A paper describes a structure:
Here, we report the identification of ZnuCBA and ZniCBA, two ATP-binding cassette permeases that are highly conserved in Klebsiella species and contribute to K. pneumoniae AJ218 zinc homeostasis, and the high-resolution structure of the zinc-recruiting solute-binding protein ZniA. This system is comprised of a cluster A-I solute-binding protein (SBP) that recruits Zn(II) from the periplasm, ZnuA, and an ABC transporter, ZnuBC, that actively translocates SBP-delivered metal ions into the cytosol.
Crystals of the SBP in the Zn(II)-bound state were obtained and the structure determined at 1.59 Å resolution. A single ZniA molecule was present in the asymmetric unit with a fold characteristic of proteins belonging to the cluster A-I subgroup of ABC transporter-associated SBPs (Scheepers et al., 2016). The N- and C-terminal domains were linked by an interdomain α-helix and the protein bisected by a cleft in which the metal binds. The metal-binding site was located ~13 Å from the molecular surface of the protein and comprised by three Nϵ2 atoms, from His58 (β2α2 loop), His123 (β6α4 loop), and His189 (β7α6 loop), and one Oϵ2 atom, from Glu264 (β10α9 loop). These four residues bind a single Zn(II) ion via 4-coordinate geometry, with bond distances of 2.0 Å to 2.1 Å. In the Zn(II)-bound state of ZniA, the metal-binding site was occluded from bulk solvent. The structure of Zn(II)-bound ZniA was next compared with the closest phylogenetic match, AztC from P. denitrificans, which has structural similarities to both Zn(II) and Mn(II) binding SBPs. Structural superposition analyses revealed that the SBPs had similar global conformations, with a root mean square deviations of the Cα protein backbones (Cα-RMSD) of 1.3 Å.
Author numbering: 23 to 292
Amino acid sequence: TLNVVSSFSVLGDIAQQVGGEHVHVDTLVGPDGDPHTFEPSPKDSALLSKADVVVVNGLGLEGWLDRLIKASGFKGELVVASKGVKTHALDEEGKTVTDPHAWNSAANGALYAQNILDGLVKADPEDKAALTSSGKRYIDQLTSLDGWAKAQFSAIPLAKRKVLTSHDAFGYFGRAYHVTFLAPQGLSSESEASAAQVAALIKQIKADGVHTWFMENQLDPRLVKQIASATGAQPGGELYPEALSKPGGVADSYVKMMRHNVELIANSMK
Ligand SMILES: [Zn+2]
């Protein structure tokens, strides 16, 4: 059985579904964990030294990766799950900043799963037929999930499709399924929201009639609650943008994470 380490919980689940009985997957960032503020520990280094495959997001999400690979002595296979995926970027200070959250489009999740399948087959060719069978089944589930998600938003009004959340993690979801996401913090929870941005969000919501706000499982909800209180926005619940729920929760897998987020956002539209 291949020993696989994922950088964070979402990728660990995709690797588990693709690999099935032929992989054992551990994750560095766990359920409800913030991937932006994470730094790895000696326990993480020890775990990676035993691994056959490491699965990461790329797109700048794991700044610590190279130093952890060096310290651990990891000599296995590195799989960048975002390879080939079309990225989005923000235009800031005359430069571009890549948005790493590409998996919140289920069509991109299917591309992630194909990259992970490719890496597992490369690392375990003895099981290539079995891995390809379970992988292609999962990929088909994800492209059909993408079609289901589009359908939940396509037959409802295009006007006023705006929600408020804690940070800018749903950009690819919003582009794929056509919903505008507002948030006081940007692409990363390493950066505090400026007074300028908080004031502008409150003004925008008051002026443009945003009705629903969400918290996120990996990020302190105090700030989004402050904006909601200043605007009278009503709660829509808890979204799971970049970490699975704990076991027994509403977002125990990537599929269930996507379904949960789609259901909650669509229901708030409505
Ligand atoms: Zn994020």
